[PDB]
Design an enzyme around this catalytic site. Structure first.
Site, PDB file in Angstrom:
ATOM      1  N   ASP C 318       0.811  -1.211   0.000  1.00 47.47           N
ATOM      2  CA  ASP C 318       0.000   0.000   0.000  1.00 47.47           C
ATOM      3  C   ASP C 318       0.849   1.266   0.000  1.00 47.47           C
ATOM      4  O   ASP C 318       0.436   2.292   0.551  1.00 47.47           O
ATOM      5  CB  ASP C 318      -0.945   0.003   1.200  1.00 47.47           C
ATOM      6  CG  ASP C 318      -2.051  -1.019   1.072  1.00 47.47           C
ATOM      7  OD1 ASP C 318      -2.782  -0.980   0.059  1.00 47.47           O
ATOM      8  OD2 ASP C 318      -2.191  -1.859   1.984  1.00 47.47           O
ATOM      9  N   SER C 343       2.394   6.820   0.398  1.00 51.48           N
ATOM     10  CA  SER C 343       1.544   6.115   1.358  1.00 51.48           C
ATOM     11  C   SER C 343       0.111   6.253   0.859  1.00 51.48           C
ATOM     12  O   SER C 343      -0.517   7.299   1.043  1.00 51.48           O
ATOM     13  CB  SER C 343       1.702   6.674   2.766  1.00 51.48           C
ATOM     14  OG  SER C 343       0.673   6.202   3.616  1.00 51.48           O
ATOM     15  N   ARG C 344      -0.402   5.197   0.224  1.00 52.74           N
ATOM     16  CA  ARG C 344      -1.710   5.275  -0.414  1.00 52.74           C
ATOM     17  C   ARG C 344      -2.844   5.448   0.587  1.00 52.74           C
ATOM     18  O   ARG C 344      -3.906   5.959   0.215  1.00 52.74           O
ATOM     19  CB  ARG C 344      -1.947   4.031  -1.270  1.00 52.74           C
ATOM     20  CG  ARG C 344      -1.063   3.973  -2.505  1.00 52.74           C
ATOM     21  CD  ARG C 344      -0.867   2.548  -2.987  1.00 52.74           C
ATOM     22  NE  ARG C 344      -2.029   2.064  -3.722  1.00 52.74           N
ATOM     23  CZ  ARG C 344      -2.086   1.960  -5.042  1.00 52.74           C
ATOM     24  NH1 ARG C 344      -1.057   2.282  -5.807  1.00 52.74           N
ATOM     25  NH2 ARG C 344      -3.205   1.520  -5.609  1.00 52.74           N
ATOM     26  N   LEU C 345      -2.653   5.032   1.841  1.00 52.57           N
ATOM     27  CA  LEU C 345      -3.675   5.264   2.857  1.00 52.57           C
ATOM     28  C   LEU C 345      -3.846   6.751   3.138  1.00 52.57           C
ATOM     29  O   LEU C 345      -4.974   7.239   3.266  1.00 52.57           O
ATOM     30  CB  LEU C 345      -3.327   4.510   4.140  1.00 52.57           C
ATOM     31  CG  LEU C 345      -3.887   3.094   4.305  1.00 52.57           C
ATOM     32  CD1 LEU C 345      -5.399   3.138   4.442  1.00 52.57           C
ATOM     33  CD2 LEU C 345      -3.479   2.192   3.153  1.00 52.57           C
ATOM     34  N   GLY C 346      -2.740   7.487   3.232  1.00 43.05           N
ATOM     35  CA  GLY C 346      -2.816   8.920   3.436  1.00 43.05           C
ATOM     36  C   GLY C 346      -3.350   9.284   4.810  1.00 43.05           C
ATOM     37  O   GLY C 346      -3.150   8.575   5.801  1.00 43.05           O
TER      38      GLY C 346
END
Ligand SMILES: Nc1ncnc2c1ncn2[C@@H]1O[C@H](COP(=O)(O)OP(=O)(O)OP(=O)(O)O)[C@@H](O)[C@H]1O
Ligand SMILES: Nc1ncnc2c1ncn2[C@@H]1O[C@H](COP(=O)(O)OP(=O)(O)O)[C@@H](O)[C@H]1O
Ligand SMILES: [Mg+2]
Ligand SMILES: [Mg+2]
Lengths: 109, 117, 528, 37, 43, 570
Positions: C318, C343-346
């Site tokens: 991710d 960081s794709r979650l953010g």
């Protein structure tokens, strides 16, 4: 109970190695801040202990080198009552008062 | 007489510094210790180190005898033995909270299904 | 009882003959200590790869073996905590004692749990690194790859993330695949020294161990993590590293007769890693309620991100933290490249206070880099040039961090808010200033009677701008001002320091008495 | 510039004494007078 | 230039590895055929 | 009791203990240059051309606590190191398996077993006798009960179909003892230093057997904590060598790795008073002979154990040289309690031999045609070098990087184990700079605060920064001229030039090429010299004076002498 609330604040640290130790048991009349001396790697703490059963004042120094040892050393305040076991260090030959290393300690504040 | 006492002190200081900085035996690193009526009072009463300091020698000897441990003529030895006994958890090893399943609240008075027949 | 006979021993594999219902990865016992797993089999024989080695056991053609008829399952013992184990459970270094009672037995190739058993990732994972926690957040249940060159600090970053869980009740699992035993013993020592040994396990398969052990070590680690997750525990897993695991799988497959594919790896190298890394995530209350966070490590060659295995692993996790060799040579530690890291979650993986504090810092950092690389002529646009050259340098100074130094999540957020409010303008590259500020904030938020409640409020709820301003102005700033004016001489004449700290309440009289009483350098009210 | 180990010890002591003087100067900079009654 | 070199080297390496394994897989046709025969007969 | 204390020491032990004799300064002032130089050479401190400096060096060496400890112990009855966990010799067996060759090829032979008292094990050795010569064949694959495949350890000439072979069901073994020092052998123990083949007296140990009671014993190790002193300014200041770790010597062809290897062997044997094991893998015959002859000439031959897997031998024999050297080092540490410095050259040839053996035995090649077990084999070699209660095993391994391709799989496998990398440059050598070590490219993990002081770290960091900055500014100087620099840039460039030239050093082994005597520089002397240069104190001295000197004072003295001569000449 006066000592009931002191039980919840007990903090005990120990080593599984057994060396020859000097046992101190009493109240902390005065304790200063911490100093970094050996290339900012160690911690130096001067302690004034009023012992139990004799009520005499003794002056010692404590050395901390690891993170856990520094954490244990930071728990000691004024009027704190300690059962401390301390290994003598060979650097006291150049010191007015002995330098020690914490082997086992029980701290109540 | 070959090695002077001053140089021996310096060597001792250096060797102590080396032994403190790099540790080979893991038993040399400080570890933080995890922390019907009459039997409960015997097995659960907890004393402070200052409280045991205020005690007399006979009282500490009696307390050591009550828990079936050694009796000593020294004050400090008695205090140390009692402290080691009470602080050391027989079952807890500070590695059991990781083995304890989490607690989800449960019905204390639940309905029961019909009897199978 | 024995029902198999060894026929050939070649390619480090054993060829057992016998009539049995073989299954893939079925344990075959050659003694009470040595066993292997079935890789390929037919109606009269099988090929087995050994996991152990015994000095007194001399396997040879004609030796007898028992096909236990059970799949390879790792047993769970109570003394795993604070221990180094191998893929079969034996304790190589232990701190406590075992009870010879198996808490559970987990199958290593346990299929990932389906979609309906999952939940959203919304709870922060503290890594102890300010740049990571503020710009590249990691949530509980995320898969974040640490990718970079050799000797750049990937293992240091993973160990730092695993040290920040000292007082968070998050289990730590560290899987070593082809690592040196010296380094593993050193990591064990560091764990013991930093008070997380009772909370951690280390699964080890050395570089000269059996190829099957090095192949199946991450799966055994994941099975242990799944055991811990099934009782509602948050588990943080580190794999060091998956390039060695890919090499081990390639060696095992080549020695077994499997045809090479791209870069000599087998044809299903992507499936091997995807079915491994898809076992992490956050699960629902009815399916365990815990989480598993994975931090796999990958090594590139001279910055070549476009390698086969690195690009396979990027397309599974991710996001990634990329460690740059140029920054490491320049002296930046940790050498983390923000431009190439994602960081794709953010902000979904950040708490409300941290999301508010670190909002829009990556943009400012990229703008500062763009300006620095393209200053060109001495002509200056406006005061905004000084604004950028000030805040970007303050952020860069915030980036640096000593090894094994854990910086708390709230301390990082407060530092970000101080930076954004202009309370770091006086900085002129004096590391002791930020060291003092970090220590003061840490002690105040960890030990003070009112600071602890402030920290709990920051952790749980999302405060607004006015309440944060009141918190900063009435408690934090007086403490910081006193503890800065008593250590930094040049702060007496620093025009910016007076310009920002003139109206702050003086609290020297009380903090003096606190110092004289032996209190730490952050207590402002009392110890809880 | 670069320093010798003895010079590092001297610098450490200089910083400690500077901090002591800063302790005194922090009280001095608080321009205060004893309360009258 | 980096992009083109990476693509070309990957292509060449994969072709070389496949062509090398071709000989090994050719040399073991008889064993596969005999195994297929004996599995077909079976029980 | 002088008679009693001397009764526990052999005459050779007394001869050795004559080195650790304390000389008073009153006596030392009365020596001559010749006697002082003899003492320095005997104690490994190198020649000195000044009297008071030689006395100071001898006093500094003598005032060390280790030297005083050795001198004090030399006047006491012998204390014997009690070996815990020794190496056990192989067990005595008979020839229990018999067979004959049934298939032949290049380097691979198939053996069919006829009379066996026990089933054949992997990696065991079959012996064949052809024309009074013994040939060893190592087992690789066991096809069935009575049919195995083997590869030659040595020369395959004379083998044919039907050659009878016998085996003890044991792997290859070599004779190890203290008598191995001063002798040259091959991995399987054949004598290589004389035609009559005088035997080596010792016990037969199997190098492929590790003799561990359990795997957990392999985790009872002490992580590296100490820095080995080499006497080379650049290595000591910038690239500290771990004691108990691994240092790689990397570069192309002709950069000068072997001279560094010889210098380190000599310095470890003389100054550090230890035992050296050399393991040549794919060693050229000319280079092996040359190194043996210079070992004899320079006087470190009697304390070095040479193992030579020659370039012309079969790949199976070339592969075993590293394992045999590691076994000798393990014997010298575990059985005798002596710290060993093991030298390996060349690691690339070890990897190549492994790849050759894998390809010969019909295994599917990995990427770039290497063996599938590349990393496994590298770990197998490198994981037996460590540091235990008995002593330290330090390794200094030379590697050849083909076409400077640092992404080659062999290099990538090697970097996984190196604790300090020293990278040599052909351009820097071509500029005449020796030991031609690149300070910017090389790095060591031991240049931290865990092992070194604050002063050492500050000096190293400032030196690297100054060298990089002057390298950057030299291009500007070349293009736009030296005038285009600013006022600070000129001083930076001059300091960087003097720093770069001060790092050069003459070796006591390299006297064959340039004829200049070598020198041994302590860490403190190098630190003080670099500290003096960094401050700009010696900025009034021409750069040509800073080349190939020992200490900072030599440049000052030579410049003062030249200035005096110039003042007298006019
Ligand atoms: N924050 C830091 N400050 C100072 N030194 C650091 C820091 N982080 C890492 N290092 C040092 O950098 C070096 C490399 O670190 P580390 O071993 O974690 O890297 P790696 O990428 O895993 O390397 P390897 O290729 O050896 O596996 C070590 O010497 C370590 O002590
Ligand atoms: N310190 C040195 N001084 C002078 N010449 C050197 C030195 N080191 C190496 N050389 C040169 O290197 C040549 C031999 O190269 P060698 O040491 O075999 O390098 P490599 O082993 O890396 O190929 C010799 O001719 C010698 O002149
Ligand atoms: Mg690493
Ligand atoms: Mg060479």
């Amino acid at each position: 109970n006066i000592f009931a609330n002191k039980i919840a604040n007990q903090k005990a640290y120990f080593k599984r190695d057994i060396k020859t130790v000097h046992t101190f048991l009493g109240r902390v009349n005065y304790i200063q801040r911490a100093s970094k001396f050996n290339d900012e790697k160690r911690v130096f703490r001067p302690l004034q202990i009023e012992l139990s059963g004799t009520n005499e004042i003794v002056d010692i120094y404590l050395e901390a080198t690891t993170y856990i040892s520094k954490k244990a050393l930071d728990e000691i305040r004024q009027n704190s009552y300690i059962f401390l076991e301390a290994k003598w260090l060979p650097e006291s030959n150049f010191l007015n008062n002995p330098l020690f290393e914490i082997q086992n300690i029980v701290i109540e504040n | 007489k070959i090695i002077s006492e001053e140089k021996e002190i310096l060597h001792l200081i250096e060797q102590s510094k080396r032994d403190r900085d790099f540790i080979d035996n893991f038993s040399k690193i400080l570890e933080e210790k995890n922390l019907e009526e009459i039997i409960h009072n015997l097995l659960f009463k907890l004393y402070s180190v200052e409280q045991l300091a205020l005690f007399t020698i006979d009282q500490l000897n009696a307390l050591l005898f009550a828990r079936g441990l050694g009796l000593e003529k020294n004050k400090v030895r008695a205090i140390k033995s009692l402290l080691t006994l009470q602080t050391s958890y027989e079952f807890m090893e500070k590695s059991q909270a990781a083995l304890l399943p989490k607690v989800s609240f449960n019905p204390t008075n639940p309905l029961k299904p019909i009897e199978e027949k | 009882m024995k029902n198999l006979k060894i026929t050939a021993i070649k390619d480090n594999l054993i060829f057992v003959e016998g009539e049995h219902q073989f299954s893939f990865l079925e344990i075959i016992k050659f003694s009470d200590k040595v066993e292997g797993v079935v890789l390929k089999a037919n109606d009269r024989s099988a090929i087995v790869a050994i996991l152990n080695e015994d000095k007194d056991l001399n396997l040879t053609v004609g030796s007898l073996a028992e096909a236990t008829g059970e799949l390879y399952k790792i047993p769970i013992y109570d003394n795993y905590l604070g221990s180094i184990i191998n893929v079969l459970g034996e304790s190589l270094v232990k701190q406590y004692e075992r009870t010879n009672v198996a808490l559970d037995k987990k199958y290593v190739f346990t299929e990932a749990q389906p979609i309906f058993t999952r939940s959203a990732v919304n709870e922060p994972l503290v890594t102890g690194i300010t740049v990571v926690d503020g710009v590249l957040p990691v949530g509980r249940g995320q898969k974040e790859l640490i990718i970079g060159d050799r000797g750049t600090g990937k293992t240091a970053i993973a160990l730092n993330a695993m040290l920040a869980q000292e007082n968070t009740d998050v289990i730590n699992i560290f899987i070593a695949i082809g690592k040196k035993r010296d380094e593993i013993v050193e990591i064990y020592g560091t764990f013991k020294k930093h008070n997380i040994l009772h909370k951690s396990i280390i699964v080890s398969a050395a570089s000269d161990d059996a190829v099957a052990a090095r192949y199946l070590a991450p799966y055994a680690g994941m099975a242990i993590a799944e055991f811990f997750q099934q009782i509602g525990k948050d588990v943080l897993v580190v794999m060091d590293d998956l390039t060695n695991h890919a090499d081990a799988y390639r060696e095992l497959s080549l020695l077994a007769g499997i045809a090479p594919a791209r870069e000599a790896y087998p044809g299903d190298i992507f499936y091997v890693h995807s079915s491994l890394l898809e076992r992490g995530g956050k699960y629902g209350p009815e399916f365990g309620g815990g989480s598993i966070t994975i931090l796999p490590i990958a090594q590139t060659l001279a910055g070549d991100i476009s390698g086969y295995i690195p690009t396979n692993l990027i397309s599974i996790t991710d996001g990634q933290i990329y460690t740059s060799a140029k920054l490491f040579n320049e002296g930046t530690r940790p050498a983390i490249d923000v431009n190439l890291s994602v960081s794709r979650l953010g902000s979904a993986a950040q708490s409300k206070f941290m999301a508010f504090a670190s909002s829009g810092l990556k943009k400012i950092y990229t703008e500062y880099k763009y300006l620095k690389r393209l200053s060109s002529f001495s002509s200056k646009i406006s005061n905004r040039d000084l604004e950028t050259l000030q805040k970007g340098k303050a952020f860069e100074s915030l980036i640096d961090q000593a090894e094994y130094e854990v910086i708390d999540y709230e301390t990082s957020a407060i530092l970000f808010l101080l930076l954004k409010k202009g309370f770091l303008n006086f900085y002129t590259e004096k590391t002791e200033a930020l060291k003092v500020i970090i220590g003061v904030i840490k002690v105040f938020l960890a030990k003070d009677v009112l600071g602890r409640k402030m920290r709990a409020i920051l952790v749980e709820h999302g405060i607004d701008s006015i309440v944060w301003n009141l918190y900063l102005n009435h408690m934090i700033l007086p403490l910081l001002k006193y503890h800065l004016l008593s250590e930094l001489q040049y702060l007496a004449t620093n025009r910016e320091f007076i310009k920002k700290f003139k109206d702050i309440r003086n609290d020297g009289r009380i903090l003096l008495a606190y110092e004289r009483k032996g209190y730490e350098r952050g207590i402002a009210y009392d110890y809880k | 510039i670069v320093k010798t180990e003895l010079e590092y010890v001297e610098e450490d002591s200089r910083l400690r004494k500077e901090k002591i003087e800063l302790i005194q100067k922090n009280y001095d900079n608080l321009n205060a007078k004893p309360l009258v009654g | 230039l980096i992009l083109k070199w990476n693509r070309a080297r990957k292509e060449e390496a994969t072709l070389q590895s496949t062509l090398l394994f071709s000989a090994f897989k050719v040399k073991n046709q008889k064993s596969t055929r005999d195994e297929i025969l004996r599995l077909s007969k079976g029980k | 009791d002088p008679e009693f204390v001397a009764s526990t020491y052999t005459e050779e032990e007394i001869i050795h203990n004559l080195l650790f004799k304390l000389y008073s300064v009153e006596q030392l002032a009365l020596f001559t240059i010749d006697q002082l130089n003899a003492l320095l050479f005997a104690r490994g401190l190198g020649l000195e051309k000044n009297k008071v400096r030689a006395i100071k060096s001898l006093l500094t060496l003598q005032t060390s606590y280790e030297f005083m400890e050795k001198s004090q112990a030399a006047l006491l009855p012998k204390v014997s190191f009690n070996p815990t966990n020794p190496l056990k010799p192989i067990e005595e067996k008979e020839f229990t398996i018999f067979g004959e060759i049934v298939e032949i090829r290049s380097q691979v032979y198939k053996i069919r077993i006829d009379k066996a008292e026990e089933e054949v094990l992997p990696k065991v050795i079959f012996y064949a006798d052809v024309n009074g010569k013994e040939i060893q064949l190592e087992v690789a694959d066991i096809f069935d009960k009575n049919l195995v495949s083997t590869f030659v350890l040595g020369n395959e000439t004379g083998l044919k179909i039907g050659t009878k072979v016998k085996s003890k069901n044991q792997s290859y073994a070599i004779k190890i003892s203290k008598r191995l020092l001063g002798r040259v052998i091959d991995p399987i123990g054949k004598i290589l230093d004389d035609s009559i083949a005088t035997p080596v007296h010792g016990n037969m140990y199997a190098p492929l057997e590790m003799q561990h009671d359990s795997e957990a014993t392999r985790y009872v190790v002490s992580p590296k904590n100490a820095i080995l002193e080499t006497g080379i300014k650049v290595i000591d200041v910038l690239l500290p060598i771990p004691k108990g770790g691994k240092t790689g010597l990397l570069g192309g062809a002709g950069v000068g790795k072997t001279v560094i290897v010889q210098e380190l062997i000599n310095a470890f044997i003389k100054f550090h008073d230890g035992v050296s094991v050399f393991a040549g893998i794919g060693e050229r015959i000319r280079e092996g002979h040359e190194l043996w002859k210079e070992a004899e000439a320079l006087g470190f031959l009697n304390k070095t154990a040479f193992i030579f897997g020659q370039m012309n031998e079969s790949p199976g024999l070339r592969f075993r040289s590293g394992i045999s050297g590691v076994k000798v080092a393990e014997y010298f540490r575990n059985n005798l309690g002596k710290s060993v410095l093991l030298f390996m050259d060349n690691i690339f040839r070890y990897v190549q031999a492994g790849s050759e053996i894998s390809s010969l035995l019909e295994k599917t090649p990995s990427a770039v045609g290497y063996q599938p077990t590349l990393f496994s084999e590298m770990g197998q070699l490198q994981e037996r070098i460590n540091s235990t209660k008995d002593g330290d095993i330090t390794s200094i391994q030379a590697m050849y990087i083909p076409a400077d391709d640092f992404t080659d799989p062999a290099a990538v496998a090697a970097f996984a184990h190196f604790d300090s990398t020293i990278i040599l440059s052909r351009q820097l050598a071509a500029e005449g700079v020796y030991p031609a070590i690149d300070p910017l490219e090389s790095n060591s993990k031991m240049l931290s605060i865990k092992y070194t002081s604050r002063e050492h770290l500050d000096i190293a960091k400032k030196t690297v920064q100054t060298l990089e900055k002057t390298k950057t500014l030299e291009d500007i100087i070349n293009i736009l001229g030296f005038d285009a620099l600013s006022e600070d840039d000129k001083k930076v460039v001059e300091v960087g030039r003097r720093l770069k030239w001060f790092l050069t050093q003459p070796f006591v082994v390299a006297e064959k090429f340039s004829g200049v005597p070598g020198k041994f520089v302590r860490l403190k002397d190098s630190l003080k010299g670099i500290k003096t240069i960094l401050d700009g104190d010696l900025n009034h001295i021409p750069v040509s004076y800073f080349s190939f000197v020992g200490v900072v004072e030599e440049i000052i003295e030579k410049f003062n002498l030249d200035a005096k001569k110039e003042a007298l000449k006019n």
